[PDB]
Design a protein around this ligand. Structure first.
Ligand SMILES: CCN1BC=CC=C1
Ligand code: NA
Length: 164
């Protein structure tokens, strides 16, 4: 297990434009296209991202290319954020993957409300952090995924992703 395999489990792989859990147009391995309700706007974003006129359909290689860019962007975003970087730096590599997962799903300022969780994680108060992380819209709307990510933060193991 690693961040790529983890997010591949959590996001799936679909080669045609679909709507994500929030109803937003997405493709590939959780590549958010736009929050616009316009399918045409989504298709334009796709063409821009891939560099060709798609039919709203991409190849697996193309999906994986966007995925690698998106993982890289999530990490880069953490490192550029004054609140996130010190906590991320304090973590072991398994828990760093859990952090990247959250930023991939919600965005860097979408984790803005996790101040208290962040403190508990830097303190390595893992059970307390896990309890706090679950007190969130995130957990309520995507509980199975959040439970896996939270277990990863609680334990520093890949146990929640085994047999998946
Ligand atoms: C709240 C979990 N995270 B996210 C980004 C960096 C460090 C910890
Ligand atoms: Na998805």
């Amino acid at each position: 297990m690693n961040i790529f395999e983890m997010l591949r489990i959590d996001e799936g792989l679909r080669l045609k434009i679909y709507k994500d859990t929030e109803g937003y147009y997405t493709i590939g391995i959780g590549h958010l296209l736009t929050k616009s309700p316009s399918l045409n706007a989504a298709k334009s974003e796709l063409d821009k991202a891939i560099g060709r006129n798609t039919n709203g359909v991409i190849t697996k290689d193309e999906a994986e290319k966007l995925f690698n860019q998106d993982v890289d962007a999530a990490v880069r975003g953490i490192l550029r954020n004054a609140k996130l970087k010190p906590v991320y730096d304090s973590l072991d590599a398994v828990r760093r993957a859990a952090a990247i997962n959250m930023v991939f799903q919600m965005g860097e300022t979408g984790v803005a409300g996790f101040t208290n969780s962040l403190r508990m994680l830097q303190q390595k108060r893992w059970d307390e952090a896990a309890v706090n992380l679950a007190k969130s819209r995130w957990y309520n709307q995507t509980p199975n995924r959040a439970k896996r990510v939270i277990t990863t933060f609680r334990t520093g193991t890949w146990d929640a992703y085994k047999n998946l």
